[PDB]
Structure formats: structure tokens, C-alpha cells
Design a protein around this nucleic acid. Sequence first.
DNA 1: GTCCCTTTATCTCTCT
DNA 2: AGAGAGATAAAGGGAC
Length: 485
Amino acid sequence: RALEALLTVAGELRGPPLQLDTGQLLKIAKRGGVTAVEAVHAWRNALTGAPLNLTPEQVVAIASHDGGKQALETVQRLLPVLCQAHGLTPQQVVAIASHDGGKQALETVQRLLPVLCQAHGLTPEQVVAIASHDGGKQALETVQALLPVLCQAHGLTPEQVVAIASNGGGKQALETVQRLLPVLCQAHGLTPQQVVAIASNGGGKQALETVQRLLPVLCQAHGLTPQQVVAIASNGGGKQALETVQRLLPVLCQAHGLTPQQVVAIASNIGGKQALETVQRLLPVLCQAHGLTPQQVVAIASNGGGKQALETVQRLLPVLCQAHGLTPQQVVAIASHDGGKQALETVQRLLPVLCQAHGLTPEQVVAIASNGGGKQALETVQRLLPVLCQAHGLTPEQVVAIASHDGGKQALETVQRLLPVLCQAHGLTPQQVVAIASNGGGRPALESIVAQLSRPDPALAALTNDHLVALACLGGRPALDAVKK
DNA sequence: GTCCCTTTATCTCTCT
DNA sequence: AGAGAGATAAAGGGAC
């Protein structure tokens, strides 16, 4: 009988000061719950207004987790203390809240930040890193606790300790390293380095126990070099890829004619369990009715979310080749990255619109879709290729060159925003800008140049605008950063 | 309902 | 340009 108030509330959030859309109320109501939704509406005016000055997106980002209400009340209370007593940016405060049990991680940060920063020479960037996950305060307490005994007695660096703690379940990972480090750097014969690689992913603990167990087994059985097994486990949810390999290695090996190199090459990714399993269902069909080769199959499988890519290829190769006229070779190009499934769906959807009101060739389209975030780049091209070419004096071929990299989208937006100030204000030519953006690292290379030009370092005017440009072209921000030094 | 841990998908940047 | 590193986020599930 309260459903009336609930809906009235979730109808009133649709206006000021928050103006939320369906999918956001859905996001909150989902992960945050009825009580997150209600709290949001209570503090809409208090969260938005000074001194907190939060944004709608920020407020959703907090609310939409187990704890939403708690984390909202906590953030309201602590943001000022964290920023003014502890020199944190509101951004960082938000990143820490935006997880399950915000309240815990915030409070624990406020408490431990001094003693970790002072007494344990950590930087607030690092502490923020560790708090910014689920169970952040477990992580925090376990770092406070174990950092000495881990650095001194086990011989680690604090950067490694930080790296292991900056996953969800960092607590468990720290303790598990503390336990098993000796029983691996000696008993199966591994670098720390390797162990550290293993423990620095979520489920690092699981991956650690699992290896501790199977490294003697799997490495003197199926013939895996132990380097290969580390490879496998020093990845997302390794555990599962380790067992899944223990099962499916001989099979796919003998029953599917797969070399251990490729099985290993598949499991050596996030969700490798799913990649191995799905390759075991679908390796056939794919090579039978689709003509694809085992090589190309392994290929599609050896990026992250292999299973999505595989299944989307099995479902979309024919309609793609048959209707939109693409080669199997091209389809494999588009699938052979992370988010492949997405890349494919977006192509199939967009090849039409793109190759028409934009005059884009299918080859340009497949070029765009054949990198990570391919779908992002596509959508961004579709949105901007009008805005750009026209009211900014570019050509489709250039827009294509800017999209045709990882971060295609970041690059296209950054260009949209910075073209004016760089061309005019600092006297650069569009060919230059385009040169720079047309690499992976576009966004930051642009930003790093624009910065270098608007607040030009006094002992950096040794170099010419065109030398800078040559350098952002060469190695983006990394290279313009190796100058300001 | 709040808090913690695991696994899986996706996206972006770096370094040569 | 491709392998590596890094980072963002959702979807499980267990515990009290």
C-alpha cells in the first residue's frame, strides 16, 4: 500500500534538481533498492547544492550499489572532511563511495589515511586506489597490517602491495600471498614477480590457491611450461581457467586437433573458462558450416570475452557475409578483439546508415570496427561525422583515420573539443591535429599538447610547435611527458 | 538490506 | 600495429 509513495517518489526524481531518466531509476532501484531510491529523493537538494556540489551522474553512481543510502549519508557527511582535512578531490571521494559498502571504505579511509600516508609512506593516490573497490576497508586494514611484514620479511615493494590490494577482495589476496609466497618461490620454483602478477587480479586468492595446487600436476603432465601456467592464472578469474584447462586440454587437443599453445592462449584471458568451453562446443560448426579454420577460431577465442565473440560470430557471420557482403576474413578481423560481440552487433546494425548518408565504404567500416571499443568508435563516427566534416572543415577519410585506433571514440571527442583552441589560439593546422589523434593515445596526446601550449613550460620553449607535434605524433603524452622532464 | 569476495565483459592507453 | 597493462562496470554468489 506504499507502492503509491514509491512510484510518486520515482516519478518526482524525474524532475529538479536531478532530472533522472528511466534507466537510471532502474539502475538504482536494481542495485541500490527501494531505500536507495527514497534516500536519493530526500537529499536531492542537499547533495546537489553547496558545499557538496555533486552532479546527477555522481549521485546515481553512489546510490546504485548495495548500501546506496548509507554511502549517500556518509558522502554527505565526509566529502568536506576528506577534501579539506585530507586533500582529496571530490572525484576521489565519489570513486570510493561508488561501490558496495561505501560507508565502510569512506570511514576507514578517513581513519587510516594519515597513518598510511605518513607512517607507511603511501600517497593518497594509492590509498584511494585501494579503497576504491568492494570491501575497500578490509583491503585498507589488511595493508596497514601486512605492509611491513610483506615488504620487510617477504621482500616486496610497496608498489606491489598496493597493486595486490587494489582489487576487490584485496584483503584475501594479501593474506594469501603472505601464506603461499614461500611455498611457491621455492617449492614449485617461481619468481615473486610471477606470484605478484597472479595475486594482483580480483580473485587473486583463488588463483593463488589453485596454482599452489596444480602447478606440480599440470606442469609435469600436459607438458605446460610453468611460465605458461602463470600466464594462465595471472589473469581474470584464473582459478576457473586453470581447472577448465585441467579438464579440456587433452580433449580439444586430441578431439579437436588443438595444440597446447592455443588452449593455453585461450585460457590466458579474462573469462577463459568460457572461452575454452565455448570453443569446445563450437570449434566444429565454425569450421564446418562457416568454413573458418582452427587457427581463426583460436584467434577469435584468444581475446577477452572469447565466448561472446564466438557466439556472435556463429550467429552473425552468414547474415553479415550474405547480406552486408563481408568476407569471413573481415568478420574474423572485427571479432578478434575485446568486446568483439559488441563490435559485430554494431556493425551489422550500422553498415547501412554509415555507408549511405556518410559515403563510408564497407572497408572503412570494418577498419573502424577492427579495434577494441570498435562499437564505441562506430557510434561516435555515426554521431560526429556530420558535425565534424561540416562545421569544422574535415574530410570523412580523416575522421576515419582518427576513429581507426583503440580509443577511436575518445580521440574523436577530444578532437571535436580541442580543434578550435589548437588551430586558432595556438596556430596549428588540422592536418597536424589529425596526425596526432590518429594514433592510440589520441585523447591524452591532444590534451598534453594543448596543456603544453596554453601554460607553456618556460624551459620547454626550446622546442617548436612543430617539434611538439612531431612528438605527440611519435609517442603521444608519454613522449611529451619525457620532455617536461 | 548491507557488506564482502569472485568471475566475466568491455574499453582505453602504453611502449616500443 | 600488437602484445601488454590499466582501468570501468555488471553480474554472480555467500555471509549476517
